[PDB]
Subunit: 421 residues, 2 copies
């Protein structure tokens, strides 16, 4: 099997029409996918995307096309033999690196391309991605990862030790996953643009559905946030776990003051209180708002930044995103760093196809990395699942384990035509 070509689609969805996804930083996102198909001579094609919120999607498309020169002509077997080597290769064009390195449009594109390869690999072997990786031995999983710029915090030997320690319980955990699924929380009642009445209704829906955890956007107006969280608590009840997300908007001192003003709502954590680059900033905020925890990561650019967030104790909750960084391989590296420091990973899913991706990622984390899921929650949003051949399935507050071969990301063909920008 050889990758023989690739096609790209600039897909944009009119989510702003109802302000779905609206938050303190992004008032009117148009959920969009920079979508890629890796062509083969065979029966399978590798589908992948990276997620943006409208304008700028075409910049990612440009970056995907550039990466295409590194991938077209490759043999899939060469890729599979040492995917860490492939990852170094695909992120290793020094000229393309200059556009990053491993950040912004070029790394968003890498996420799409890398995840497309996983889709292809999984389809070829007849396994959902979570199972494809979970079935691997510790050494085989270790081999997936490019450890460059990680070794001062997590060297391959220590990663291998973690993988070996988690190996003996894998079968039981797989069975448990089939029986129970993986618990998730909802942000769908929480978008900042919603009226209070809509907020009330969607809070009742979330509770009725069996979620134990619900997230709300905050950060534009303090008076609004106090009012909204008071109302949320009324509808949700005292037992509900509430979280809040500021989407990066605050300064450090502002953030500490503002979430302390929201302390009455008993939020489990504040998400992205400030810039996603500000490690020392998050750490200062963390100290100032304890016992309210601090979460961040959905825009954390790469493993180098994540390792510093984690090693410096700048956060309580690690929120990887499936295609912000260099796809599954880099996510797995971060999950191992998180496991070394006993920090939970709660993936971001606020976007088109993101749920479809991160379900597999946490399920790998559960089976083969940290071995625990009960105390964690994958993000979930109830938007745009209708465009996927195999959408995630959530009920009673949990993702059902994927069954179809691939990465759950392939879109219905009609969608590829209807939503072309």
């Amino acid at each position: 099997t050889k990758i023989t070509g690739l096609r790209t689609y600039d897909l944009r969805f009119p989510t702003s029409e109802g302000l779905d996804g609206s938050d303190a930083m992004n008032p009117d996102p148009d959920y969009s996918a920079a979508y890629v198909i890796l062509e083969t001579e065979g029966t399978h094609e590798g589908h992948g995307l990276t997620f943006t919120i409208g304008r700028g999607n075409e910049i990612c498309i440009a970056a995907i096309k550039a990466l295409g020169a590194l991938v077209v002509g490759l043999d899939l077997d060469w890729i599979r033999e040492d995917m860490g080597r492939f990852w170094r290769h695909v992120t290793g064009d020094s000229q393309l690196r200059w556009i990053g390195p491993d950040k912004g449009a070029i790394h968003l594109a890498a996420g799409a391309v890398v995840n497309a390869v996983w889709d292809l690999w999984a389809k070829d072997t007849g396994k959902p991605v979570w199972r494809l990786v979970a079935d691997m031995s510790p050494a085989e999983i270790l081999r997936l990862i490019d450890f460059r710029y990680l070794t001062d915090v997590l060297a391959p030997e220590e990663a291998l030790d973690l993988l070996k320690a988690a190996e003996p319980g894998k079968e039981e955990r797989i069975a448990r996953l089939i029986e129970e699924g993986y618990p998730c929380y909802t942000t769908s009642a929480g978008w900042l643009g919603y009226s209070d009445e809509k907020l009330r209704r969607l809070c009742r829906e979330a509770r009725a559905a069996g979620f134990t955890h619900t997230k709300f956007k905050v950060g534009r107006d303090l008076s609004d946030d106090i009012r909204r969280l008071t109302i949320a608590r009324e509808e949700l009840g005292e037992d509900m776990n509430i979280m809040i997300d500021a989407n990066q908007v605050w300064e450090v001192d502002e953030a500490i003051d503002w979430v302390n003003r929201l302390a009455f709502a008993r939020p489990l954590f504040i998400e992205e209180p400030t810039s996603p680059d500000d490690v020392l900033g998050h750490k200062a905020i963390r100290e100032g708002v304890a016992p309210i925890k601090v979460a961040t990561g959905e825009m954390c650019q790469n493993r180098i930044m994540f390792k510093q967030f984690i090693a410096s104790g700048a956060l309580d909750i690690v929120q990887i995103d499936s295609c912000r960084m260099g796809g599954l391989n880099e996510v797995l590296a971060v999950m191992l760093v998180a496991a070394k420091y006993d920090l939970p990973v709660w993936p971001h899913a606020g976007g088109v196809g993101l749920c479809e991706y991160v379900q597999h990622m946490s399920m790998i984390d559960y089976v083969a990395i940290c071995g625990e899921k009960d105390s964690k929650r994958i993000e979930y949003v109830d938007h745009l699942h209708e465009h996927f051949k195999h959408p995630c399935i959530v009920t009673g507050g949990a993702y059902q384990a994927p069954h179809a071969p691939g990465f759950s990301i392939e879109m219905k063909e009609d969608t590829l035509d209807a939503f072309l920008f």
Copy 2:
């Protein structure tokens, strides 16, 4: 004056013919400019560029075009009235922020567009950019900067104190700059691909010309580094200051061992010993290679990363780049942070037009911010200056102060035709 339109040029120079620019990370760079011209109804046009090394330049072009939607239609007086407001505006489209924020292709593009505006402003008033800014009162300079995500280390109040404190000595320093220029160092003898014979000749030329500081690329092969540096010391003499640049290639532990092995050559600093995102890693390397200094910054993505590098004491020498970040305004922000921590700024100039840019920026630093230049060195390389209408002028180891209106970046019309990719 109104910005009425925009043109972009994908310009690529065949620098890989002689391996000019070659280093341990980038073995065959093709010096390129994602070049932009801002159109007006008047006699002036604002020229700017961001620098890349070949493939991927087109991603920057796409990002520049995207930012064009934020800039075309703007009145120049609205911009000048509060350029910090304008800076927030051009980097503030939440959807374009998703592609960054303030990093990668979108921010490189911001650098080109922001600096192009500076070029236009300077042309309109008839001054080189450095003097346009140096003639500003402390409050007017403060007004240029967007402090978002800086206030936990440098708030506007403290930045103003710094600016006010530098104010009385401005007239003297301007005089002194006109008399003396601004000292610079050369990297033109140090490219990794050069033969030993050529290394020797270039070292002799650098020494004759009166440079007191010369930089060499290292990091590909230890034996080569040992031999080349032995040769360099031999040709340059004992009074010469030698620096070395690894272009990010090492792990932390590897960097410490490798530069310590080169200690015999007495390097003033090691530049970019590791990933440009690794603040804690640079700090660890700095401890391990003492007394050899640590420099980094040419790819430091923005003020938020620079702020952490500086405040945490991860580096000795701050190497801003003129168009890696959001152009002049963000560079000035970082210079003020550096002034607070009394760290010197030695700008990167390894690329087409970079010398032309950074000469202005360090001269602003000297006259209006930190008030000291004798102990600092702006990078210089002698490549591609023949393409500029007003190239930098270097003699006796110092940049002559620009005197023609603009940012020195405008290229000759024939270059715009001949080097289109």
